[PDB]
Amino acid sequence: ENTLTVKMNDALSSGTGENIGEITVSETPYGLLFTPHLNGLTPGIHGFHVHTNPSCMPGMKDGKEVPALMAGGHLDPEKTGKHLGPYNDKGHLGDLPGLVVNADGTATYPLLAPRLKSLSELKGHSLMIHKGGDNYSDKPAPLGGGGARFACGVIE
Amino acid sequence: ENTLTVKMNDALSSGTGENIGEITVSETPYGLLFTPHLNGLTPGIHGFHVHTNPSCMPGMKDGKEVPALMAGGHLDPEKTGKHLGPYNDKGHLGDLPGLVVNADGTATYPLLAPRLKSLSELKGHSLMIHKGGDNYSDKPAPLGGGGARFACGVIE
Ligand SMILES: [Cu+2]
Ligand SMILES: [Cu+2]
Ligand SMILES: [Zn+2]
Ligand SMILES: [Zn+2]
């Protein structure tokens, strides 16, 4: 098989919340395929990124608890400093296609990330689902408009 | 840049229906990107494929009208006879990822077809949106379970 299974949990101010399912990651000739099996999300498109650190723990920023802050920022080993989505090599390597949530709150639609080649590249990082969407740009809102971190899972 | 814009219209038993927008196809290093700007669709995931003929004309089969019958079958230059989706090269080259329709009936989520490399592979063909979904296989239903043709656009 050669797959990874990532358990995803809601992210709260105090710590980890409810489990919402798993994402199965597989290798294809065209890149990594993220097949979700999730529930408990708001219907629509959600920002979906690999973050640098292997943690989903909440942390303090400017005096306020921030869910899943300890995952750090979007995975960016090339130091692009730019959020440009899964089809643009000028931005964060961790930028994945938006996560598609169905009307019934489940996520099932598989997502191809063609800039990622090997499951090894995900180990030691985290997967993040944001409250908002992802227009694959830093404008008009930074980081695609994803906003707050809703659910997260550590890879390894 | 090198783009194609495909106007899409509803396909009725009696012919061409209302315009529902356009799909813009761009070339990327990862394959052709299909960026919809559509309205008027049922929320959910819709079968989305390139069909062989540059026609959206209707026809009759077994005494029942078939919207956009004259588009023919899925684009299949290798004569696979197999519907296996956008990530499997043993199948119809015309097999694209499912088209994602938002709760408000619009389609905006970009769709990457990594098996297609050049817009020239599309010239002289048609784009089709089905009523049903697409499980990227011929089981339990042929052609992914997309069923009837809901909307159609000719490429050249
Ligand atoms: Cu993120
Ligand atoms: Cu079709
Ligand atoms: Zn990013
Ligand atoms: Zn097909």
- Give the helix/strand class of chain A: mainly beta
Instruction: Give the beta-strand count of chain A.
Output: 11
Small molecules bound in the structure, each named once: copper (II) ion, zinc ion
Distance between the termini of chain A: 18 Å
> Could you say which overall geometry of chain A the principal axes of the C-alpha atoms support?
globular
Q: State the helicity of chain A in percent bands.
A: under 10%
- The total number of structural domains of chain A is 1
Reading the helices and strands of chain A in chain order gives EEEEEEEEEEE
Radius of gyration of CA atoms of chain A, rounded to a whole number: 14 Å
The strand order across the widest sheet of chain A is 5-10-11-1-2-3-9
Which two chains form the greatest contact, residue counts included? A-B, 21 and 20 residues
Instruction: Specify the biggest β-sheet of chain A.
Output: 7 strands, antiparallel
- Quaternary state reads homodimer
> What is the beta-strand fraction of chain A?
35-45%
Count of DSSP-assigned helices of chain A: 0
Catalytic activity (chains A, B): 2 superoxide + 2 H(+) = H2O2 + O2
EC number (chains A, B): 1.15.1.1
Enzyme class (chains A, B): oxidoreductase
Function (chains A, B): Destroys radicals which are normally produced within the cells and which are toxic to biological systems.
